[PDB]
Amino acid sequence: QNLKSTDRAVQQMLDKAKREGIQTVWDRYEAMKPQCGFGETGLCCRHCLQGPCRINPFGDEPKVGICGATAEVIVARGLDRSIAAGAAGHSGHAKHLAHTLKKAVQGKAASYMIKDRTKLHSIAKRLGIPTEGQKDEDIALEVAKAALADFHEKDTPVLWVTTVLPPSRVKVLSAHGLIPAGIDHEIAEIMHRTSMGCDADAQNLLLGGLRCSLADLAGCYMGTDLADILFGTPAPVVTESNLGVLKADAVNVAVHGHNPVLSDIIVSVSKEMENEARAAGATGINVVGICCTGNEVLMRHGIPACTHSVSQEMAMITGALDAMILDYQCIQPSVATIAECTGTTVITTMEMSKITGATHVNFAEEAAVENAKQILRLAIDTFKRRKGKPVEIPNIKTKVVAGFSTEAIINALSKLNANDPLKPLIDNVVNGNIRGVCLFAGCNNVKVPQDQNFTTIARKLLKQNVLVVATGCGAGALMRHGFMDPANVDELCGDGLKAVLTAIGEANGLGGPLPPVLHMGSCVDNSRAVALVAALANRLGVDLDRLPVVASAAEWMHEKAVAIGTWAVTIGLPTHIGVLPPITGSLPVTQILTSSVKDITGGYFIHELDPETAADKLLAAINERRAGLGLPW
């Protein structure tokens, strides 16, 4: 079972699932083997009814698609469509928040409101919306309107790209025609240009993909901006993670999916309705997080994280999960089937994301509180139905310190230098205490034993004094293995990095260091790491492709993460990926993405499946950046 997951709590429930005959994602993966090699290499195309077409990676025919499409064209078209799908997912999430803010400040969704006035005002100034002399509800309405405007063509390009990156970076991107004109405009243009009998030039295709990946960055950043306005900018918090955060005695309610517009309300209302859970014989309502919406409520409210990504079914297998509350993205549809065996009430809430067999509760922002009550009452009723039934919650959990927004990181640094808060961090980069910065992002993937790449690469980089920040299921993987607990700084961190984490933590009145890894939030909160690295770049007067900053999507899965890794490359970062995407069937495409894209953006993909080697290659990329600045390494 340790070949399936490195998580001991996950291993325990794989054993339960096996003896109870419940099929798991790993069983379904086993049943899928050997997987198709055409699809695995990218040498397959179904973009018209003359297909499916395939190309032998080596040997005799077929060598070309029926229409004449080459291996490099087919491979670039499929990758482009992946980026556009990811962009669409982050786009719909941000759009949802934009509509919610608009409804809130027009008196239509009274359950929502401007909770962060400081963020609202700083966003308006970033965008050049006037603050002085304007009411907050009118500033917010203007900000919401500008968010919605970035989805279509207009007189300006996408502001959630051009106002968030260093200006030298925007200039370099504009010179190559890479600045998105509108978020949904780029998505549609990708779908067009990759359809049959359109764009048939690998380089042209890939440049379109880089541009669309910046449409995804825009959606992430606007998702983060809007969620902070509506729900508060995260600040450091302490909580726990892994399955041991379930309580046999309480009504265990999982928020699962991505968008907090729903889950943030569930958190708030659950607190009020906890007298009503006691009436049914539970201690209360134990709200726990799964996947990114769990990260959202962990980052803002300290909701404990139950589990993540590939292992999400395992929360159900305990027998104690009374309800799983879904919006969209990364929900294994199997949870609807597994619920028949575990008793869990699975509830979908968004019109465009239903699962056959799951209870659907239409959720409307105008009636959010009533909807949350109806859903929490279904959870209460399910906990009743399992009173007396035996549960197996693995007694396994870790301590998690999280909530490291870019605002919170800068504020923490400000305690060392009040008027130049980035200077102490840069000072320790220059003197070697911080070797560089690595962002871990993305998913788990059934192809990789869960968390194995994340923890192995992280252990090695931390020893080498790398400041590690993490998001999404990368943060989930690290937090479930102890990397967000300050008690592990001595074991995990190098002396230089420990010095820095200790100085900052003690200067923030903690008596202890910062945790070994800084949790910066959900997948859209990859935008927070951009905001930080862009702030570092601007204080130093250099572009991102000169900073000792790298990224690792060490176990990635979703089209969203493909878009993120592409925009990490596009904004100039060396970007390690731990599962090969379907590109190896074209050497020219692989070469563009791993080498010659350096000449355009300064970033590049690092393909490396073995995580020890991956850590070496990431350190090498960090140290090459150090040298280009004339720094010791």
Q: By CB under 6 A, name the one of 35, 50, 106, 174 that touches ligand SF4.
A: 50
Nearer to a second copy, 62 or 628 (CB): 62
Judged by CB under 6 A, the stretch of 31-39, 299-307, 521-529, 566-574 that binds ligand FES is 31-39
- Sign of the Cα torsion 534, 535, 541, 547 reads negative
Nearer to ligand FES, 57 or 494 (CB): 57
Interatomic CA distance for residues 621 and 598, integer angstroms: 12
Binding-site entries:
36, 44-45, 48, 53, 67, 258, 292, 330, 443, 473, 523
Nearer to ligand SF4, 253 or 448 (CB): 448
Judged by CB under 6 A, the stretch of 37-45, 118-126, 210-218, 224-232 that binds ligand FES is 37-45
- Phi, psi of 4, deg, nearest 5: -90, -50
User: For the purposes of burial, counting CB atoms within 10 Å of the CB of 35, is it exposed (0-12), middle (13-18) or buried (19 or more)?
Assistant: exposed
Binding-site entries for [Ni-4Fe-5S] cluster:
258, 292, 330, 443, 473, 523
| Residue 393 site contact among Fe ion, a second copy, ligand SF4, none (CB < 5 to 8 Å, cut-off depends on kind) | none
Task: For residue 36, state whether it binds ligand FES (rule: CB under 6 A).
Answer: yes
Nearer to ligand FES, 227 or 446 (CB): 446
Q: Determine how β-strand 44-45 pairs with β-strand 53-54.
A: antiparallel
Q: By CB under 6 A, name the one of 22, 44, 144, 372 that touches ligand FES.
A: 44
Judged by CB under 6 A, the stretch of 64-72, 79-87, 292-300, 616-624 that binds ligand SF4 is 64-72
H/E run at residue 519: strand 517-521
Do 586 and 65 contact (CB within 8 A), yes or no? Answer: no
Tokens 């719909």 map to which residue? 92
The torsion defined by the Cα of 99, 101, 103 and 104, in degrees rounded to 10, comes to: 160
Interatomic CA distance for residues 173 and 238, integer angstroms: 40
User: Closest CB to Fe ion belongs to which residue?
Assistant: 291
Judged by CB under 6 A, the stretch of 50-58, 293-301, 429-437, 481-489 that binds ligand SF4 is 50-58
Tokens 């995804």 map to which residue? 216
Interatomic CA distance for residues 333 and 355, integer angstroms: 6
- Phi, psi of 611, deg, nearest 5: -70, -30
Task: For residue 57, state whether it binds ligand FES (rule: CB under 6 A).
Answer: no
Binding-site entries for [4Fe-4S] cluster:
36, 44-45, 48, 53, 67
Task: For residue 52, state whether it binds ligand FES (rule: CB under 6 A).
Answer: yes
- Phi, psi of 23, deg, nearest 5: -75, 140
Helix, strand or coil, per DSSP, at residue 246: coil
Interatomic CA distance for residues 368 and 494, integer angstroms: 47
Task: For residue 480, state whether it binds ligand FES (rule: CB under 6 A).
Answer: no
Instruction: Indicate left, alpha or beta for 154 from its phi (over 0: left) and psi (-120 to 50: alpha).
Output: beta
Task: For residue 609, state whether it binds ligand FES (rule: CB under 6 A).
Answer: no
Tokens of 508: 């923030």
| Residue 29 site contact among ligand SF4, Fe ion, a second copy, none (CB < 5 to 8 Å, cut-off depends on kind) | a second copy
Q: How far is the CB of 197 from a second copy (least distance, A)?
A: 4
Interatomic CA distance for residues 290 and 306, integer angstroms: 6
Please state the separation of Cα 500 from the chain's center in Å: 26
The torsion defined by the Cα of 464, 469, 474 and 478, in degrees rounded to 10, comes to: 60
Task: For residue 75, state whether it binds ligand FES (rule: CB under 6 A).
Answer: no
Task: For residue 244, state whether it binds ligand FES (rule: CB under 6 A).
Answer: no
Judged by CB under 6 A, the stretch of 59-67, 151-159, 562-570, 587-595 that binds ligand SF4 is 59-67
Task: For residue 362, state whether it binds ligand SF4 (rule: CB under 6 A).
Answer: no
Task: For residue 48, state whether it binds ligand SF4 (rule: CB under 6 A).
Answer: yes
Task: For residue 32, state whether it binds ligand FES (rule: CB under 6 A).
Answer: no
Tell which residues of the chain come right before a gap with C–N over 2.5 A.
none
Q: How far is the CB of 54 from ligand SF4 (least distance, A)?
A: 9
Which residues have C-beta within 8 Å of that of residue 30, sequence separation ≥ 6? Answer: none
Give the x/- contact pattern for ligand SF4 in 568-607, rule: CB under 6 A.
----------------------------------------
Per CB under 6 A, residues contacting ligand SF4 are 45-48, 50-51, 53, 65-67, 69, 74, 196
Per CB under 6 A, residues contacting ligand FES are 36, 38-39, 44, 46, 52, 54
